Amino acid sequence: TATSDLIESLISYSWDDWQVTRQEARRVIAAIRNDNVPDATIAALDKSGSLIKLFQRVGPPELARSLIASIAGRTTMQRYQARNALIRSLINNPLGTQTDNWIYFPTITFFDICADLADAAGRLGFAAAGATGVASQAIQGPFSGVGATGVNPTDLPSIAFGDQLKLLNKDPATVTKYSNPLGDLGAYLSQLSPQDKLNQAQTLVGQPISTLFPDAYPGNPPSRAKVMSAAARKYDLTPQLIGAIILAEQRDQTRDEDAKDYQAAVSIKSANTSIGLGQVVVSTAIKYELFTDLLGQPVRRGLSRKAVATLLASDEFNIFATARYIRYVANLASQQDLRKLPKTRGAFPSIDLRAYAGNPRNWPRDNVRALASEYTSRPWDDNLSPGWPMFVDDAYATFLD
């Protein structure tokens, strides 16, 4: 193809010239991304015996990630040829893409994640969507976590040494500083007018996903709204419900909490923190296979625990896990015996367990209130969160408009 021809020369060695430059590497990636016949191009490179060389010769890990994500993303019939060539290139040259934020993904796993993700984005309807909102510039206080700011928890600096010691020393006050920002939930909502709340909603949902795999997408990363819409369709929810759950979490979230959340999880301790947009617990994502609809079985079951914590910091994986978890809590509720949940019945008189099996459009509002309680806490043990139901319900009212 036109593209295979261009790449072959871009990466070729000549006498006394055995180095592909950064500039050439970037032109290769750009050419891959602009290709109208990506399968044909890979077929052509493999026929040339140039496919292995392509992977071997685009060296710096940041460029290797763009290369690999782009190829994994756009290929179909030739996907496994590219995959085999990558594997070949990794023999006695193993580092690959596994550096920086991506240190918990072996290179072939990075390839497979991108392929599966791209396929899911195409199939589920979130491959592309222009931004409809703008990130906040806040750095502290409620609504200064990734939901508001678009700043990826894995990009945050190490917690400062002094605070790290206080945290380790179980210092009550420092622990609070890196914990949920809110005490009095109703007091916080009273700070906001209806338009303020709608504006937080638009910021949350309208900005592009903060993704660890931007080149797995055909163009720019889609807005979170597009992904929540796709997750809602997949799990028979509504995006308003998913948005309400996440907006409530993100109000009760700060930049500092994001740093603690992620750093503790990948530290020597492997903490079981709640991570990302929906504040999904690491062990929970594993136990209920929350990445099922974006990643095939082999890739999922091979992820290390720290790799799972990392994916929960990638907005699209988090949105889907959150939605899949919401549908789990709802399904589980529909299997319960209301007579055996008298505290739940007392708090939410209009709760209809059988309705949980259907679409939220048809749930009583008390179902949303109860699920909110049973999202922040252990679900359906008849122990309730006093504050979370109204907090999530307020976010829901805003989205429902």
């Binding site: 179980k170 009550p172 622990v175 914990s179 949920n180 809110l182 005490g183 009095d184 939930l185 109703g186 979490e249 009760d252 603690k260 959340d261 503790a264 301790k269 903490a271 079981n272 923190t273 709640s274 929906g278 504040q279 999904v280 617990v281 062990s283 929970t284 136990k287 049973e374 999202y375 922040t376 806490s377 252990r378 679900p379 122990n383 969160s385 006093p386 504050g387 979370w388 109204m390 907090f391």
Partner: protein, 120 residues
């Protein structure tokens, strides 16, 4: 701020907690309408603690206890302390629950409640 059960249990109500008398002691619930409120309970108990529990010195004596952890929600895993100290020929038992995403809570308020409790 002191509380006295007819069975002789006397304890201090924690500041900011609503109190309620139970069959053998008292239940306490954190005030307001929190996301993740602490709950505490204290009771006079005749049956001794189970064997092979952990121990810690508490004030002037010792206490036997166990912390149980269970899957929770976005606020973290559910934790529950169960603790007992000898009070005469009997025991005073305190249990307490809380969610945490940062590992095991200190249960400071719970230990303080058990520590100052007596059967007078």
């Amino acid at each position: 701020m002191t509380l006295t059960h007819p069975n002789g249990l006397v304890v201090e109500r924690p500041v900011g907690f609503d109190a309620r008398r139970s069959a053998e002691g008292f239940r306490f619930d954190e005030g307001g309408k929190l996301r993740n409120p602490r709950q505490l309970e204290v009771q006079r108990q005749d049956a001794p603690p189970p064997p092979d529990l952990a121990s810690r010195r508490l004030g002037d004596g010792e206490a036997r206890y166990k912390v149980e952890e269970d899957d929770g929600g976005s606020a973290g895993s559910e934790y529950r302390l169960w603790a007992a100290k000898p009070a005469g020929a009997r025991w005073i038992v305190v249990s307490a629950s809380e969610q945490s995403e940062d590992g095991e809570p200190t249960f400071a308020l719970a230990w303080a409640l058990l520590e100052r409790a007596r059967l007078q």
